Design an enzyme around this catalytic site. Structure first.
Site, short mmCIF file in Angstrom:
data_model
loop_
_atom_site.label_atom_id
_atom_site.label_comp_id
_atom_site.label_asym_id
_atom_site.label_seq_id
_atom_site.Cartn_x
_atom_site.Cartn_y
_atom_site.Cartn_z
N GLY A 1 0.83 -1.20 0.00
CA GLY A 1 0.00 0.00 0.00
C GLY A 1 0.87 1.26 0.00
O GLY A 1 1.99 1.26 0.54
N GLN B 1 2.21 9.95 1.35
CA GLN B 1 3.51 9.31 1.45
C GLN B 1 4.48 9.71 0.32
O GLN B 1 5.69 9.45 0.41
CB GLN B 1 3.33 7.80 1.48
CG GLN B 1 2.70 7.33 2.77
CD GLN B 1 2.58 5.82 2.82
OE1 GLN B 1 1.70 5.25 2.20
NE2 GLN B 1 3.49 5.18 3.53
N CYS C 1 5.11 0.11 7.74
CA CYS C 1 4.76 1.27 6.93
C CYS C 1 6.03 1.76 6.24
O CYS C 1 7.02 2.01 6.92
CB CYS C 1 4.21 2.36 7.85
SG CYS C 1 3.43 3.62 6.89
N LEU C 2 6.00 1.92 4.92
CA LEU C 2 7.20 2.38 4.22
C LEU C 2 7.75 3.70 4.79
O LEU C 2 8.95 3.99 4.65
CB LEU C 2 6.91 2.54 2.72
CG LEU C 2 6.58 1.23 1.98
CD1 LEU C 2 6.19 1.52 0.55
CD2 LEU C 2 7.79 0.30 2.01
N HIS D 1 -5.56 1.02 6.63
CA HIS D 1 -4.25 1.58 6.89
C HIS D 1 -3.95 2.73 5.92
O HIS D 1 -3.47 3.79 6.34
CB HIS D 1 -3.20 0.46 6.77
CG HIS D 1 -1.78 0.94 6.82
ND1 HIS D 1 -0.86 0.44 7.70
CD2 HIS D 1 -1.12 1.83 6.04
CE1 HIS D 1 0.32 0.98 7.46
NE2 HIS D 1 0.19 1.83 6.45
N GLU D 2 -4.23 2.52 4.64
CA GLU D 2 -3.99 3.53 3.61
C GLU D 2 -5.00 4.65 3.75
O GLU D 2 -4.65 5.81 3.55
CB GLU D 2 -4.12 2.92 2.20
CG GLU D 2 -3.09 1.85 1.90
CD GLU D 2 -1.68 2.30 2.23
OE1 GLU D 2 -1.29 3.42 1.84
OE2 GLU D 2 -0.95 1.53 2.89
N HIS E 1 -3.97 7.21 6.24
CA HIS E 1 -3.01 8.19 5.76
C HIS E 1 -3.68 9.47 5.25
O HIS E 1 -3.17 10.57 5.45
CB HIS E 1 -2.18 7.60 4.62
CG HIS E 1 -1.04 6.76 5.07
ND1 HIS E 1 -0.02 7.26 5.85
CD2 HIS E 1 -0.70 5.48 4.77
CE1 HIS E 1 0.90 6.32 6.02
NE2 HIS E 1 0.51 5.24 5.37
#
Length: 154
Positions: free
Chosen positions: A53, A58, A96-97, A138-139, A142
């Site tokens: 994701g 991000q 998470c990236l 989760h996305e 953001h």
């Protein structure tokens, strides 16, 4: 470090600390070629970092969209809305990236009803569960400036 690989075309992923990750994203209004190209770059970037994701903030874009791939191929989600959330939940470990090497346990609804648009502005509505539902939330988080650390499970 003495050697570096410069990447181009794909996006740079923003790391925790960059305030763009806390800024509530605004909705997308223009469904043009640029949005499509951006989505392509989002998928390129996500796969390149081995993520499942990646949301616009991000990559420094505070707009309401993200892409994700929970095993069936990349899905582009524009202006999502979570219409319903099952009261039943489950806790699992999430990374998470934007938080290199940090993983925490988070409780997420097991099933959700979502609504979103595709790159052409057309609406899609669907029910998601398990992993798919988790990644979506989760996305989605953001887009509201919510990150995994705001949800550590006690």
């Amino acid at each position: 470090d003495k050697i570096h690989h410069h990447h181009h075309h794909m996006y740079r992923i923003r790391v925790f600390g960059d305030p763009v990750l806390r800024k509530r994203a605004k909705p997308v209004t223009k469904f043009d070629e640029n949005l499509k190209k951006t989505i392509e770059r989002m998928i390129e970037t996500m796969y390149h970092y081995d993520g499942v994701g990646l949301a616009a903030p991000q990559v420094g874009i505070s707009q309401r969209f993200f892409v994700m791939d929970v095993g069936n191929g990349p899905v582009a989600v524009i202006n999502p809305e979570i219409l319903e959330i099952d009261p039943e939940t489950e806790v699992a470990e999430e990374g998470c990236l934007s938080f290199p090497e940090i993983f925490v346990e988070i409780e997420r609804s097991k099933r959700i009803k979502v609504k979103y648009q595709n790159t052409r502005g057309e609406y899609v509505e669907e029910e998601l569960e398990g992993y798919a539902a988790r990644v979506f939330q989760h996305e989605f988080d953001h887009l509201n400036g919510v990150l995994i650390i705001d949800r550590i499970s006690p």
